[PDB]
DNA sequence: CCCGTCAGACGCTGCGCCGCCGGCGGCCGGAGAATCCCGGTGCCGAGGCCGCCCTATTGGTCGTAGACAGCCCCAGCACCGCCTAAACGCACGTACGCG
């Protein structure tokens, strides 16, 4: 079940089990209101050599 | 004709080859998670300094440990012979041990 992300939008609540994000399995991109400490969002890519092998969680 | 002997082909048996698969082993890349420095910052406490006095040093003594000078004599050391128990060598083997 690959959904196209939506920007999920949560003015006051929390990045709930109610974020469309979360309901749709997927992370909350920076485009979400989810706040900067939305635990859905993605980390960082930190992968020294290249960004390009199975080491690289991207 | 079929049997009999030998011969030749078949079937069966045993083998290796062959391809596949697996497992293994090795080696490595590189994330990443700590540790490791490296530099900036600020104390507080060495360390440093001063006042002072109580103890360390000086002079004298005197009397006694202790040297030392001498000495006797035990007993530690040699050694000597005869003895045998005690030591030694080996002979198994099974049982602790080590994996």
């Given at each position: 079940?690959?959904?196209?992300?939506?920007?999920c939008d949560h003015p006051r609540q929390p990045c709930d089990s109610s974020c469309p994000c979360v309901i749709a399995q997927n992370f909350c991109e920076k485009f979400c209101q989810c706040?900067?400490?939305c635990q859905?969002?993605?980390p960082?890519?930190?992968?020294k050599a290249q960004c390009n092998t199975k080491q690289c969680p991207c």
């Open positions: 079940h690959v959904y196209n992300y939506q920007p706040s900067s400490e859905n969002r993605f960082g890519c930190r992968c």
